[PDB]
Amino acid sequence: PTVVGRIPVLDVRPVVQRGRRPAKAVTGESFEVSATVFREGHDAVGANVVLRDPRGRPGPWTPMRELAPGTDRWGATVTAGETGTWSYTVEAWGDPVTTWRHHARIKIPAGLDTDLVLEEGARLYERAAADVPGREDRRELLAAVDALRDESRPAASRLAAALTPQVDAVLARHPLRDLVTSSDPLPLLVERERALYGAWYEFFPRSEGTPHTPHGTFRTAARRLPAIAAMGFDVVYLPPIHPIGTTHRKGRNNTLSATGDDVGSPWAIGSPEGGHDSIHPALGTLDDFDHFVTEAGKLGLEIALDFALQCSPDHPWVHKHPEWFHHRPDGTIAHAENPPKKYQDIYPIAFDADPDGLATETVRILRHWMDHGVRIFRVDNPHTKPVAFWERVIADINGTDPDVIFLAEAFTRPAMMATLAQIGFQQSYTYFTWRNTKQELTEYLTELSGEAASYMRPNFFANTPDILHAYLQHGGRPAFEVRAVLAATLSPTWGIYSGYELCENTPLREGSEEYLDSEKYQLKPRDWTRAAREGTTIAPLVTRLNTIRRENPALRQLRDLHFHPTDKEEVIAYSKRQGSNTVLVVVNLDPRHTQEATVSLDMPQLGLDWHESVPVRDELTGETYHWGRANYVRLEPGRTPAHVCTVLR
Amino acid sequence: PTVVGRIPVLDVRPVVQRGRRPAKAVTGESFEVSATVFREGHDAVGANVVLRDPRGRPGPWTPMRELAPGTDRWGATVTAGETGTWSYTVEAWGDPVTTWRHHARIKIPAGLDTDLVLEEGARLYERAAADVPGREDRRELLAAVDALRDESRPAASRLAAALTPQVDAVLARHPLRDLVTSSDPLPLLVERERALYGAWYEFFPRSEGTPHTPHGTFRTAARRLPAIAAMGFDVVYLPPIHPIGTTHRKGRNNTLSATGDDVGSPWAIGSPEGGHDSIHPALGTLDDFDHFVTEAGKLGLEIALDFALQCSPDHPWVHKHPEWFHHRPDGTIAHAENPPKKYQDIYPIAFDADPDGLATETVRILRHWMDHGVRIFRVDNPHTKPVAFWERVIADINGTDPDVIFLAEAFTRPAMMATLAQIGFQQSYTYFTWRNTKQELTEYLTELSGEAASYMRPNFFANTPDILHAYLQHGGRPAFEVRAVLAATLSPTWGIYSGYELCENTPLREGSEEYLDSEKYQLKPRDWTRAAREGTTIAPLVTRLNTIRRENPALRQLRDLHFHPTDKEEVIAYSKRQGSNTVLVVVNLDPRHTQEATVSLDMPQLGLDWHESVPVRDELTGETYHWGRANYVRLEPGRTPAHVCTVLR
Ligand SMILES: OC[C@H]1O[C@H](O[C@@H]2[C@@H](CO)O[C@H](F)C(F)(F)[C@H]2O)[C@H](O)[C@@H](O)[C@@H]1O
Numbered sequence A, B: 001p002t003v004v005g006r007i008p009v010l011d012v013r014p015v016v017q018r019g020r021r022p023a024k025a026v027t028g029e030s031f032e033v034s035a036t037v038f039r040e041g042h043d044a045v046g047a048n049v050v051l052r053d054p055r056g057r058p059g060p061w062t063p064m065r066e067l068a069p070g071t072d073r074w075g076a077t078v079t080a081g082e083t084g085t086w087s088y089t090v091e092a093w094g095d096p097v098t099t100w101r102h103h104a105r106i107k108i109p110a111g112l113d114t115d116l117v118l119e120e121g122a123r124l125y126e127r128a129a130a131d132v133p134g135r136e137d138r139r140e141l142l143a144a145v146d147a148l149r150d151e152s153r154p155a156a157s158r159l160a161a162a163l164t165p166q167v168d169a170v171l172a173r174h175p176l177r178d179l180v181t182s183s184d185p186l187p188l189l190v191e192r193e194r195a196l197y198g199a200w201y202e203f204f205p206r207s208e209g210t211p212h213t214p215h216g217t218f219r220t221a222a223r224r225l226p227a228i229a230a231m232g233f234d235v236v237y238l239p240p241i242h243p244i245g246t247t248h249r250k251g252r253n254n255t256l257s258a259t260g261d262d263v264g265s266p267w268a269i270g271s272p273e274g275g276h277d278s279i280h281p282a283l284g285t286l287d288d289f290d291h292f293v294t295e296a297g298k299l300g301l302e303i304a305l306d307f308a309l310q311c312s313p314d315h316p317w318v319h320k321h322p323e324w325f326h327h328r329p330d331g332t333i334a335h336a337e338n339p340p341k342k343y344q345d346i347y348p349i350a351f352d353a354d355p356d357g358l359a360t361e362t363v364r365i366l367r368h369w370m371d372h373g374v375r376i377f378r379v380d381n382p383h384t385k386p387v388a389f390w391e392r393v394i395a396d397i398n399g400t401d402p403d404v405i406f407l408a409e410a411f412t413r414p415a416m417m418a419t420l421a422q423i424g425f426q427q428s429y430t431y432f433t434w435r436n437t438k439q440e441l442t443e444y445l446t447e448l449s450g451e452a453a454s455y456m457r458p459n460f461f462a463n464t465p466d467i468l469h470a471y472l473q474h475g476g477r478p479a480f481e482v483r484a485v486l487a488a489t490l491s492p493t494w495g496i497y498s499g500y501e502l503c504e505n506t507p508l509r510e511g512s513e514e515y516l517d518s519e520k521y522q523l524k525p526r527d528w529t530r531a532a533r534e535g536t537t538i539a540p541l542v543t544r545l546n547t548i549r550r551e552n553p554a555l556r557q558l559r560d561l562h563f564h565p566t567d568k569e570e571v572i573a574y575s576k577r578q579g580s581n582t583v584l585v586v587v588n589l590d591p592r593h594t595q596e597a598t599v600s601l602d603m604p605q606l607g608l609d610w611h612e613s614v615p616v617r618d619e620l621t622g623e624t625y626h627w628g629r630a631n632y633v634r635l636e637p638g639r640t641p642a643h644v645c646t647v648l649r
């Protein structure tokens, strides 16, 4: 038994961990299946992709083409349908009809062995007709056969009868395939739309309180939900909603000792009041939570809860399950770290004394919140827990509830980030916030939209409670507008942390990416009404970007992305396409100076000829333009961060 | 059962077709095994390579190192021993001692609960001691344990006692490994030295005849062997030695009609005198062949026979096995092509009617010649036969006779060239002859010496009966000198086709790569004795190159090769290393003009400091130099084509 088949079909992609983990897609998402296909001798090959659904049913006829001359690399686009575990194969084959046509087209005008050549053509078309199911199609081919054999017609006429468009149509759909050879099937995990596409909004319920009761509840925080939905978001992500420890509770601005009314960090989970399956008593009850979830649902918002597998020193687990922690010789548990950051208010979990107990309890907790309508979890720092632990937990949860989405908050080295996605995380945080120059952005998104897209779905948060980039610090509102445009148009999933709209950008100190008076350690009431009235919010820009995304399919996918040359380092241009929808974006990365540039569009990449010019509408302003191979732009920060254009019919 | 283990160890390389074919080596050859290794959290990892021989026996302790900071890619060099099928795995582990040392070196000077840190180190060293077999090593570690625990001593000195070199030595030999995780085993095929290293000489026995009998015999051809051994060759490759057909026999200079005593192409195999298992009547008998093989052995020369699976029209197979050929509707068999080259004198084989019969007869023929001492086969145009056919044939033969070496003469596209090597071919012809500028050679050898070396062993023929490159045509003798130096020093296997050393360079016509009056179609008597007497031969240079290769282990391997910058386009520099042997080569690629250049060596790549300088000897001349960071060279065509220097010790 040979490893290589009759007609070699090798190195089928996409592939994850040599086939041990599935490649990823979502419903309706297109992606390219490719392979290395060739044969011995000089005759032609063909190839096609067979995508099988969870019941094993093959999809449509999907012929491949060679992707570049001389490479023997073949590819075709396939589209994922319903959710579940799919599989795909590549089939390679001798293509004798293409070979014969190429030869016949030369030998017949030349008068070389024309009777022999034409009879050879007849015998091929006969064999082709054998595997054709439709009688009318069979007759079309038999007609070509009989004309090929009609020795009373001129040679050129006999040949032309075999090359009609009606003949071609039958053969494109039902080619004569010699020596059909398959690859072994590769697995494909198809998940719901929201795993790839969605806009995310993060906020702290406790900050949305009242004059008499500053600490918000689920009842009072539910009042933010309409504004969040009105901005076009689809997911609300909440920091931990559990009780917060008192022992070593942190004070305002990440100081070591809390005083008086200090609320502590939500990530210091657990107290006598309860742990990960409990509600912070100042937020209300489980019933209040259900109400909040119902109200979010009515507005088209899904809740994403923070899952942080760690404990305050006051968490029940500390005495109920001591072996879930590493104890030093004197009995103490060292507080967690993420150097040079220190987390004195929490203990990390130890996994090697009782991995089964931890896993059982972890999925019990997740299933608790799932029963209260939470189908998305934002997983805090998963790279500090064992990789195989997440693999097991996610397979367990998705085994009964495949719609549950896990988002990996792993800001770490590339190997770990990729692995966490590959072992099951539906979504990943990225390096987005640390990619701000044109080169950084171009390089990173080429990586994300390239091969990584077969296992990773990026969630572009333009800020988070722990990340205020110096770009925003130094650039002010024009920088906030640029990052929102970039995040919203470069990834099918993006997000902001509340306060981004107001352009909050005062850091803890120079050189830090922490906010001053961080909301992690104090209530932060914000005057939303005033900001709206005084126009000191970019909420209208955020709203518009999400509307443009909702209306343009090209912006709801990841893999089709192309960067176009510009003659200015500060100006970046790119396009994305999905079917007949084409979006073209031009961004001035300079938040402080006006930039004019020439944008030289890669026209064949837009599916246009170099001479052509197309109508475009800038969806940020309503202005229309006619663009071609080279277009002038002038972008004034404060007035215009970018052009976000749809190509018009 | 999770796909990732406790400590992630991923993407072990080398790997060939995802583990379905083995990576390759030869006895004594070193190469890097690598993997992606990391863990959760911030603690240290360690890794090591377990190389197992054909009987399952593990090699010595082989710890890996991270190859580049922040990449989590780890590697180690291993060395292949005896021939057979080996396996390798990578083991990954938590390295608690490295972790503890790093923490202790910081915390002890700062006075941060030092009693606790030191008691944690004592318990680690206690664990580490329990496993060490050596009783002297054990008491050394437990001595450090006691020092660590002596509370009556200063903290710094308690720690310092755990960091002594004699403690380091023990733990380098027997580290404490936590949570040991292993990759799945990958296969390694180890083959004999000749598969990677050897110098080849191609000649036609019929051309080495006599005045009274111009058509050479095996007995007269044997008298040519001493001069071939004296040039330092190891392998003598003979074109087909079988009867040659008369039907459509080609005439001199590849004319379509043979006349009179035209001997025809040896590749037009078969007549009623016999086929692939027979000897051409004019060469003699099988006994004569045996004499020729015996004489070759006496001189340290192995025979490589040409295997060409194709037939003249007079081959007995044509009527005995008509289904081994593709017939046209009129019953005729179209002659072979390799467009636009036409081979009117032969029929190609068809494989899909009786593949079992063809495979069976093929290995029978090979085994016949193997019984007569032929353990190397040069396989003619394997890419016009099914890839799976060769995979089967090569597995069948190497199954009983693993020492047999197959060389693929596949001048074709890269995917097929690579696949043929991957499915079993021990050696491959290459694009070498069409790589003549510094960039071409640099790029091509970077490819060959990189990842491809895990499955492909290159045989650098500077010429063949079908390839007289324009570089040789225009450059004359000095060009022949350059190509010999390049071929012999860039690859551990190289070869020439006879007449190369006489600098035969007259093309069939301008822009052709065929020789005028090609030996493929006529007897080519060469007056070797006169060429030697008159010095009109570069045989002494060839002899010198082969002696240099025999005396310098660096030139007998492929993977270690580094190119060094020079400030002249026409001058190329490179180095190769194997243990303490280093060879530095500088070549003037201009065969018509003298070239002066500055050669800026990458001293770190030579294992030297940037300021340092080292004694070298140019093994072509005997002249000694002192070379360092930047060296002047002056290379003069016909006098000094190159420097071939060994670094002196
Ligand atoms: O309360 C513990 C810890 O909470 C925050 O740190 C978070 C950290 C630990 O869970 O994990 C991620 F990095 C995060 F969620 F992004 C952080 O917010 C506070 O920053 C930290 O000071 C506090 O000690």
Ligand SMILES: OC[C@H]1O[C@H](O[C@@H]2[C@@H](CO)O[C@H](F)C(F)(F)[C@H]2O)[C@H](O)[C@@H](O)[C@@H]1O
Pocket (backbone or CB within 6 Å): B250, B254, B265, B266, B267, B268, B269, B308, B310, B342, B343, B344, B345, B346, B380, B381, B465, B466, B520
């Ligand atoms: O005798 C047939 C054929 O022999 C030579 O061609 C060889 C070819 C066909 O076997 O395969 C390789 F490419 C080779 F061995 F390198 C060729 O020498 C002659 O060139 C050709 O003219 C002749 O018809």
